[PDB]
Design a protein around this ligand. Structure first.
Ligand SMILES: [Ho]
Ligand SMILES: [Ho]
Length: 88
């Protein structure tokens, strides 16, 4: 498929990277394209699993982790997590 890509599509590029790499999915002109990166861009949480690592957009203030796009699942110490956002 490509460097570090274990599963790819002729249309959507990489869909599953090697376990050591992070998949970044970004939509281009009504199409989705996947890239395998050694780490995630700014504002993305580096979600890690035994079989798969993924960059999840996590532009939530005071947030430490997002399981799904822009929805916080763990706030910084001292903050209260409520419906994907963190509160003083
Ligand atoms: Ho803020
Ligand atoms: Ho933390």
């Amino acid at each position: 498929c490509a460097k570090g890509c274990e599963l790819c599509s002729e249309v959507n590029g990489c869909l599953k990277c090697s376990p050591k790499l992070f998949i970044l999915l970004e939509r281009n002109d009504i199409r989705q394209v996947g890239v395998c990166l050694p780490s995630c861009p700014p504002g993305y949480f580096d979600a890690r699993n035994p079989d798969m690592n993924k960059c999840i957009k996590c532009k939530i203030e005071h947030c430490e982790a997002c399981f799904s796009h822009n929805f916080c699942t763990k706030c910084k110490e001292g903050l209260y997590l409520h419906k994907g956002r963190c509160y003083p």
